């Protein structure tokens, strides 16, 4: 109901801001009498330096941390400074039969995409009969993942397919 | 006599009104600090004004409470303050009252907190049963009576509002072996093992057995029986069923969490 | 010589009216100061102080808070002692009441002193 | 409890067709068969009769009825009470049907007593006043139903004769 102050403060468009001070500060300083209402001292040069200048996209680092001791990823001759940021060599060292490591070059780690690279498909999979069956079912299974994720999801799918087509 | 809560709420509302006026007139003492696109201070101004209006409305609503201040000038408190001037040389009585209230509340909270005690394990009287039964029967709408027909076994019987009486047997402590039966009973001249029902009180008997096996405390069986009785008292309505509909099945009841809902949903 | 509830009911609407007049005088003083400091002379009329209003509003708020605090303390100290003794004043004699109160205070003080001494002797 | 009976006048296919449809819906609900509990209540004069299953023909004529006479007690009493009541001209008929028991429940279909009548549904409850569960189960059975009118403002304590009073009211209503 007492919209008078509201409409006046809204009408007060001009740039000069000293009327509110001279109009209110006397009354408040008379009633409230703090010589230092905020006696804490504040003199701050906030930012000195904040950069490691050696970090790859941190989101990928989280996944490489969450990886199981069975998996292990690395880096090849890397076109992966900051944008691609990955084309790894993940050897699925586990209890069952081993295989050939894929590249899995992923996009920016924000991940509005997935990894799959499929580089060494040409000679590695056609050469062996078992490796040929490994690729077969694994492609069909990867054509099912809705928006797969780079390290954990794709690596686990690869291991599961490798140890499932093994039969 | 719940006027204390209303008075505390009114005190808080007045303090909030004062603080809101102070905040409004302290923020109005400062213009737009740094906008660089559009003065967003009008939003904070409108918010503070709406907060003042909210506090005024809260005070007006609390005005509806606090019906009347009764007489009884402090309820027999004046004995030496308003009494003889010799008697009040008096603050000892008020100090004792406040200290007793604080001690009671603090001990209650401490017990409720330390209920989860770190006791590793326990290693290194047919007279109080009637008293405990009477103390439990002192509750309203819980008319019970024990018979003890065979030996020291307390073959008591309960009935709250309906004809759904429960012949809950006992063993002079940690009462067990309960059987619920509705709308007629006691055949011959004693209790029975009938357990007959309409496929509904069978679930009630199962729940009661689960409860009897659930409230097994290491000591203090009186508190155990009191908790058992206040747990059983929740079966006086049978008109609620959260997480489902009212008639998901024939029956609906399992309140171990003091909220009965449809069975087969826990 | 009215009841605290009556004082509260008679103070609340005066409080609302004081708040309204406070907002009005604040708006008038602010618009006058702006017209006298930003634009042309238009408000050539004596305005109020806006301080003699806010001081009175704060006084009314504080007095209402004090009345409600007194009522709360009265009801609290009357409730806890009502559940500790029967009513007997012009069902019990006054000397017996005084002796019972003295014994109660003595027993509570003894319990507190024993507990404090034991807690101090524990360490 | 004591759930009153209604008189849903179904049409379109047939009365027997509607009865069969209701029975099919009840069977789809998951209710087994529990014998044919044909209820029978014949009016007389303002006397009445009752054969609701139970070897006790308890004619609740008026004043809430005694509902205690045996299956042959009230019958022999009325047979011996010749000349006292001379209003036997207006006869009265009775329905029949099946009786299912889903779980702590019962359903009874009231067919054509003398031939003109609707399919009178009737149900019961487990303990007893406690209409939330009754309505929640009735709504899942059909649509427009549940007139009500129980012995309200009584506390009786789950009056068993209330079913007989509802049956008499329904028979007088049609």
Curated annotation (Swiss-Prot), chain A:
UniProt PTM: Ubiquitinated by TRIM11, leading to proteasomal degradation.
Subcellular location, record wording: Cytoplasm; Nucleus
Top-level lineage group: Eukaryota
Family: Belongs to the Mediator complex subunit 15 family.
Record function comment: Component of the Mediator complex, a coactivator involved in the regulated transcription of nearly all RNA polymerase II-dependent genes. Mediator functions as a bridge to convey information from gene-specific regulatory proteins to the basal RNA polymerase II transcription machinery. Mediator is recruited to promoters by direct interactions with regulatory proteins and serves as a scaffold for the assembly of a functional preinitiation complex with RNA polymerase II and the general transcription factors. Required for cholesterol-dependent gene regulation.
Subunit relationships: Component of the Mediator complex, which is composed of MED1, MED4, MED6, MED7, MED8, MED9, MED10, MED11, MED12, MED13, MED13L, MED14, MED15, MED16, MED17, MED18, MED19, MED20, MED21, MED22, MED23, MED24, MED25, MED26, MED27, MED29, MED30, MED31, CCNC, CDK8 and CDC2L6/CDK11. The MED12, MED13, CCNC and CDK8 subunits form a distinct module termed the CDK8 module. Mediator containing the CDK8 module is less active than Mediator lacking this module in supporting transcriptional activation.
Protein name, per record: Mediator of RNA polymerase II transcription subunit 15
Protein's gene: Med15
Swiss-Prot record, chain B:
Transmembrane segments: none
Phosphoserine: residues bearing it: 118
Localization per record: Nucleus
Modified residues (N6-methyllysine): 120
One GO term describing the cellular component: transcription regulator complex
Any single Pfam family the record assigns to this protein: Med27
Primary localization class, coarse: nucleus
Record GO biological process: positive regulation of transcription elongation by RNA polymerase II; positive regulation of transcription initiation by RNA polymerase II; protein ubiquitination; regulation of transcription by RNA polymerase II; RNA polymerase II preinitiation complex assembly; somatic stem cell population maintenance
Family annotation (InterPro entries): Mediator_Med27
UniProt keyword NADP present: no
Keywords in alphabetical order: Activator, Methylation, Nucleus, Phosphoprotein, Transcription, Transcription regulation
Molecular function terms, GO-annotated: transcription coactivator activity; ubiquitin protein ligase activity
Transcription regulation found in the keyword field: yes
Residue ranges the record marks as coiled coil: none
Function (record text): Component of the Mediator complex, a coactivator involved in the regulated transcription of nearly all RNA polymerase II-dependent genes. Mediator functions as a bridge to convey information from gene-specific regulatory proteins to the basal RNA polymerase II transcription machinery. Mediator is recruited to promoters by direct interactions with regulatory proteins and serves as a scaffold for the assembly of a functional preinitiation complex with RNA polymerase II and the general transcription factors.
The family this protein is said to belong to: Belongs to the Mediator complex subunit 27 family.
The protein's name: Mediator of RNA polymerase II transcription subunit 27
Organism: Mus musculus
Organism phylogeny: Eukaryota, Metazoa, Chordata, Craniata, Vertebrata
Gene that this polypeptide is encoded by: Med27
Curated annotation (Swiss-Prot), chain C:
Localization per Swiss-Prot or TrEMBL: Nucleus
Major localisation: nucleus
One GO BP: RNA polymerase II preinitiation complex assembly
GO cellular component: core mediator complex; mediator complex; nucleoplasm; nucleus
Keywords tagged on the record: Acetylation, Activator, Nucleus, Transcription, Transcription regulation
Known function: Component of the Mediator complex, a coactivator involved in the regulated transcription of nearly all RNA polymerase II-dependent genes. Mediator functions as a bridge to convey information from gene-specific regulatory proteins to the basal RNA polymerase II transcription machinery. Mediator is recruited to promoters by direct interactions with regulatory proteins and serves as a scaffold for the assembly of a functional preinitiation complex with RNA polymerase II and the general transcription factors.
Assembly and binders: Component of the Mediator complex, which is composed of MED1, MED4, MED6, MED7, MED8, MED9, MED10, MED11, MED12, MED13, MED13L, MED14, MED15, MED16, MED17, MED18, MED19, MED20, MED21, MED22, MED23, MED24, MED25, MED26, MED27, MED29, MED30, MED31, CCNC, CDK8 and CDC2L6/CDK11. The MED12, MED13, CCNC and CDK8 subunits form a distinct module termed the CDK8 module. Mediator containing the CDK8 module is less active than Mediator lacking this module in supporting transcriptional activation.
Family label: Belongs to the Mediator complex subunit 29 family.
UniProtKB/Swiss-Prot annotation, chain D:
Protein name per the record: Mediator of RNA polymerase II transcription subunit 20
Intrachain disulfide bonds: none
Quaternary organization: Component of the Mediator complex, which is composed of MED1, MED4, MED6, MED7, MED8, MED9, MED10, MED11, MED12, MED13, MED13L, MED14, MED15, MED16, MED17, MED18, MED19, MED20, MED21, MED22, MED23, MED24, MED25, MED26, MED27, MED29, MED30, MED31, CCNC, CDK8 and CDC2L6/CDK11. The MED12, MED13, CCNC and CDK8 subunits form a distinct module termed the CDK8 module. Mediator containing the CDK8 module is less active than Mediator lacking this module in supporting transcriptional activation.
Family the entry assigns: Belongs to the Mediator complex subunit 20 family.
Protein task: Component of the Mediator complex, a coactivator involved in the regulated transcription of nearly all RNA polymerase II-dependent genes. Mediator functions as a bridge to convey information from gene-specific regulatory proteins to the basal RNA polymerase II transcription machinery. Mediator is recruited to promoters by direct interactions with regulatory proteins and serves as a scaffold for the assembly of a functional preinitiation complex with RNA polymerase II and the general transcription factors.
One GO term describing the cellular component: nucleoplasm
One MF annotation (Gene Ontology) recorded for this entry: transcription coregulator activity
Compartment list: Nucleus
Domain of life: Eukaryota
Gene: Med20
Key words of the record: Activator, Nucleus, Transcription, Transcription regulation
């Amino acid at each position: 109901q007492p919209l008078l102050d509201a409409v006046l403060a809204n009408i007060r468009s001009p740039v000069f801001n000293h009327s509110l001070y001279r109009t209110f500060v006397p009354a408040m300083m008379a009633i409230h009498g703090p010589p230092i209402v905020s006696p804490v001292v504040c003199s701050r040069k906030r930012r000195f330096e904040e950069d490691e200048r050696q970090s790859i996209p941190n989101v990928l680092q989280g996944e490489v941390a969450r990886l199981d001791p069975k998996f292990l990823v690395n880096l090849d001759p890397s076109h992966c400074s900051n944008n691609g940021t990955v084309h790894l060599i993940c050897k699925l060292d586990d209890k069952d039969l081993p295989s050939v490591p894929p590249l899995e070059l992923s996009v920016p780690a924000d991940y509005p995409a997935q990894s799959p690279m499929w580089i060494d498909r040409q000679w590695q999979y056609d050469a062996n009969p078992f490796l040929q069956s490994v690729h077969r079912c694994m492609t069909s299974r990867l054509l099912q993942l809705p928006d797969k994720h780079s390290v954990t999801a794709l690596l686990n799918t690869w291991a599961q397919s490798i140890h499932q087509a093994c039969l | 006599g719940v006027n204390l809560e209303a008075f505390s709420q009114a005190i808080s509302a007045i303090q909030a009104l004062r603080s809101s006026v102070s905040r409004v007139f302290d923020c109005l003492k400062d213009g737009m600090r740094n906008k660089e696109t559009l003065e967003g201070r009008e939003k904070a101004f409108i918010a503070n004004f709406q907060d003042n209006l909210h506090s005024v409305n809260r005070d007006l609503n609390e005005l509806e409470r606090l019906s009347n201040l009764v007489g009884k000038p402090s309820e027999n408190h004046p004995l030496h303050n308003s009494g003889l001037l010799s008697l009040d040389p008096y603050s000892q009585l008020l100090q004792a009252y406040k200290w007793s209230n604080k001690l009671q509340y603090h001990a209650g909270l401490a017990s409720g907190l330390l209920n989860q005690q770190s006791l590793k394990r326990s290693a290194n009287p047919q007279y109080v049963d009637d008293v405990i039964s009477r103390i439990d029967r002192m509750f309203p709408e819980m008319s019970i009576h024990l018979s003890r027909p065979n030996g020291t076994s307390a073959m008591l019987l309960v009935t709250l509002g309906k004809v759904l009486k429960v012949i809950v047997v006992m063993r002079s402590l940690f009462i067990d072996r309960t059987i619920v039966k509705g709308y007629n009973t006691e055949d011959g001249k004693l209790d029975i093992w009938s357990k007959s029902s309409y496929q509904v009180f069978q679930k009630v008997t199962d729940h009661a057995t689960t409860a009897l096996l659930h409230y097994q405390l290491p000591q203090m069986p009186d508190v155990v029986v009191r908790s058992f009785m206040t747990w059983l008292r929740s079966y006086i309505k049978l008109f609620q069923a959260p997480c489902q509909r009212c008639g998901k099945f024939l029956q609906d009841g399992l309140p171990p969490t003091w909220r009965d809902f449809r069975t087969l949903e826990a | 010589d009215f009841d605290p509830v009556q004082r509260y009911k008679m103070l609340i609407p005066q409080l609302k009216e004081s708040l309204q007049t406070l907002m009005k005088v604040a708006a008038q003083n602010l618009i006058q100061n702006t017209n006298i400091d930003n634009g042309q002379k238009s408000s050539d009329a004596p305005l109020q102080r806006f301080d003699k209003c806010l001081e009175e509003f704060y006084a009314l708020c504080d007095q209402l808070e004090l009345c409600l605090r007194l009522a709360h303390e009265c009801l609290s100290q009357s409730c806890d002692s009502a559940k500790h003794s029967p009513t007997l004043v012009p069902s019990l004699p006054y000397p017996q009441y005084l002796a019972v109160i003295k014994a109660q205070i003595t027993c509570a003080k003894d319990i507190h002193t024993a507990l404090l001494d034991c807690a101090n002797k524990v360490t | 409890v004591t759930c009153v009976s209604q008189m849903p006048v179904a049409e379109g296919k047939s009365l027997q067709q509607t009865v069969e449809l209701l029975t099919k819906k009840l069977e789809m609900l998951g209710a087994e068969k529990q014998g044919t509990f044909c209820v029978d209540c014949e009016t007389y004069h303002g006397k009445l009769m009752y054969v609701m299953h139970y070897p006790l023909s308890c004619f609740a004529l008026f004043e809430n009825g005694p509902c205690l006479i045996a299956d042959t007690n009230f019958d022999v009493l009325m047979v011996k009470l010749k000349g006292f009541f001379q209003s036997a001209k207006a006869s009265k008929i009775e329905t029949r049907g099946t009786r299912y028991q889903y779980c702590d429940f019962l359903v009874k279909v009231g067919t054509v007593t003398m031939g003109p009548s609707a399919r009178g549904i009737s149900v019961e409850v487990e303990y007893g006043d406690c209409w939330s569960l009754l309505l929640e189960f009735l709504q899942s059975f059909l649509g427009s139903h549940a007139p009500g009118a129980p012995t309200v403002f009584g506390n009786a304590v789950y009056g068993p004769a209330d079913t007989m009073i509802q049956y008499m009211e329904l028979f007088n209503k049609i």
